[PDB]
Amino acid sequence: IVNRYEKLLSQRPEWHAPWKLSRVINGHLGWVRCVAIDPVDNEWFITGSNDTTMKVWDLATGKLKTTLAGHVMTVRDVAVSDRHPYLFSVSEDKTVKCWDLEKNQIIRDYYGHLSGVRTVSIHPTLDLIATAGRDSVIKLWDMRTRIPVITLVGHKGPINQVQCTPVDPQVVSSSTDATVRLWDVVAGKTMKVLTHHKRSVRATALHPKEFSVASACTDDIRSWGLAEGSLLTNFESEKTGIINTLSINQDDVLFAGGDNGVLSFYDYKSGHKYQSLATREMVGSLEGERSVLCSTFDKTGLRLITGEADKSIKIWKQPGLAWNPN
Amino acid sequence: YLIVEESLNNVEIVRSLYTKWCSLEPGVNAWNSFVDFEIRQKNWNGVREIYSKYVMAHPQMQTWLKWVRFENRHGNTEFTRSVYSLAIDTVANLQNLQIWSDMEVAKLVNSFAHWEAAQQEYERSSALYQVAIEKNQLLKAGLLDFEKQFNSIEETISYKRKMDYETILSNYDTWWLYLDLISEFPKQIMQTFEKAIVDSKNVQWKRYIYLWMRYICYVELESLLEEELFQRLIDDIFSKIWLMYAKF
């Protein structure tokens, strides 16, 4: 309609600074298909991989702190907790393990997932984590009693990212069924099922200050306030690659990594793509490989960290692009 | 669902369904289907409304054309005209670039002009083209076409101007052509000629000489200017030119 387009044209987005590559830390001998940082501090960030390991990394130096070898198969995801000094990690060996960070050694392997487990999210407020695998089910664990407390049946296929919010919409799943769910853990049921994607929403992330949750199928990055479970915006992601990552920055600077490796940045809520970045790879590696598989920002937000399939981790420092809608 | 309804031959329900479908900003195809259905039904009251709705939902100039075509098929000439006006008005109204390509608007304008021509009164077409010009190349072309169809002198002049512009863009032969066009308002032409001269190895020299000669001729037709030209030539530095100057 003309009534909306005109309005869109009238409104302007804020000039977010562009992004330039800063650090590249070829250290893993495998994909680096998870990355995470400490809520409390931003000194280190760990990165689980197809190595089977996960390595810890000092941001400032870029130096490899230490390794951790508590899986058999490849690590798919990790989550350092704000409220406790535990690092949860999870691998396609079906193990959702829990590393003490006072001793850097596993403690509570949680057992229950029938098959390769894709993501963890620690609940920001509770002493409870949430994991989901190709199982097609998101189980919540009491961390003390290392048992699945509840489980969330709804989904009809493998479930990827499964973020935890502190409100009522306490889990924000995202499947290959292309539904992204909002659940009520307490009710033992769904509350609202965002079906707006076309394909496997293989990426989703909570906004820090804004109580919303960007989510990405093969192209269209939707983003939504999950209070009602209502759409907020659609991003200009029109011919970008298969969106692997979908991290959001503190300053409303949503990042999206592709299977292409084209690092695409967007103003959040606007839905305005305001940068593209061509990937890079090593002289030995192939041009098809290069692809940002996992990524996240620091708590401040000036450094984006992208794990790419070059067996690398690339950290990114910081005139905006013209609007032009449909 | 629609086909089932058709088979049944209960039509109100089908209509309702169609309406519902069309409220969900569906495909152009759906809209077209709906239109077809409406046509098939006896009434042509409501079809217009639906078309309007479609247009509103799909700001696309092809839609407008389609609507017009329906109007044409229908008996009323006034209605078509009104529709055209509305289309034009809508295009005008969004001055901001929230728009279908400038080719599509041009096309629409052309169509309107054609319609007008087919109708009794031609002034209207001319007016429309003037309006178009005021609010580019495509538009100009359309205007020219309209003129041809039909004022003729004006059209010719416009064409000449366009040609001159093209020549300038391309840019000795071109310069000459431009000069000729200018010769074919007088003050403006003179200015243009002067500019060309200013703009203006052996070949180049020859061209320059020719230009100078032309200028001299112009002056004659119209002494100080000639003197100035001579001075300029001298500075640049021919014998023939000097002789001519002396004679003058």
Binding site: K7, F211, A227, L231, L232 | -
Partner: peptide, 24 residues
């Protein structure tokens, strides 16, 4: 009518696209 009730237009519409200062 029932069908219409079942699926509404505002679902397809993003809410932020109209109002930017609006924040959840």
């Amino acid at each position: 009518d029932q069908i219409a009730k079942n699926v509404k237009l505002d679902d397809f519409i993003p809410k932020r696209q109209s109002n930017f200062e609006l924040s959840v």
